[PDB]
Each structure stands twice: as structure tokens, then as C-alpha cells.
């Protein structure tokens, strides 16, 4: 199917979609170097690089 999507079922089983937050995500998987918030045009540019 797709490489990224490998056994999504693993985590998808837990309710469906969670109610995570900026705090929870920052705590669990800290941004390399220094914490920030990637926003606007740069989001789509970052998502495009998958191709």
C-alpha cells in the first residue's frame, strides 16, 4: 500500500483519533535543537517533501 502507513492499525485501535495537545506532543517527542511551531506556507512545503 504505502511505506509511511505500515500497520497504522497498531495505534488506530486506541479509540480512533486522540485529544493530544502542544504540551503532550512537546513532552513526548521534543523538536530537535530548540522547540518551535512550524506554521503557514512552511507547513505545506514540509508536507510536500514526502513525494
Amino acid at each position: 500500500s504505502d511505506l509511511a502507513c505500515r500497520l497504522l492499525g497498531q495505534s488506530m485501535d486506541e479509540s480512533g483519533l486522540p485529544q493530544l495537545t502542544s504540551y503532550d506532543c512537546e513532552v513526548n517527542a521534543p523538536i530537535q535543537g530548540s522547540r518551535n511551531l512550524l506554521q503557514g506556507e512552511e507547513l505545506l512545503r514540509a508536507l510536500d517533501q514526502v513525494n
Binding site: 493530544l20 495537545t21 502542544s22 506532543c25 523538536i31 518551535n36 512550524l38 507547513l43
Partner: peptide, 8 residues
């Protein structure tokens, strides 16, 4: 709040 963090 979450989505900005994951892409960051």
C-alpha cells in the same frame, strides 16, 4: 496544537 508540533 498537535499538528504544528509533529511537523516541527
Amino acid at each position: 496544537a498537535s499538528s504544528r508540533q509533529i511537523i516541527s
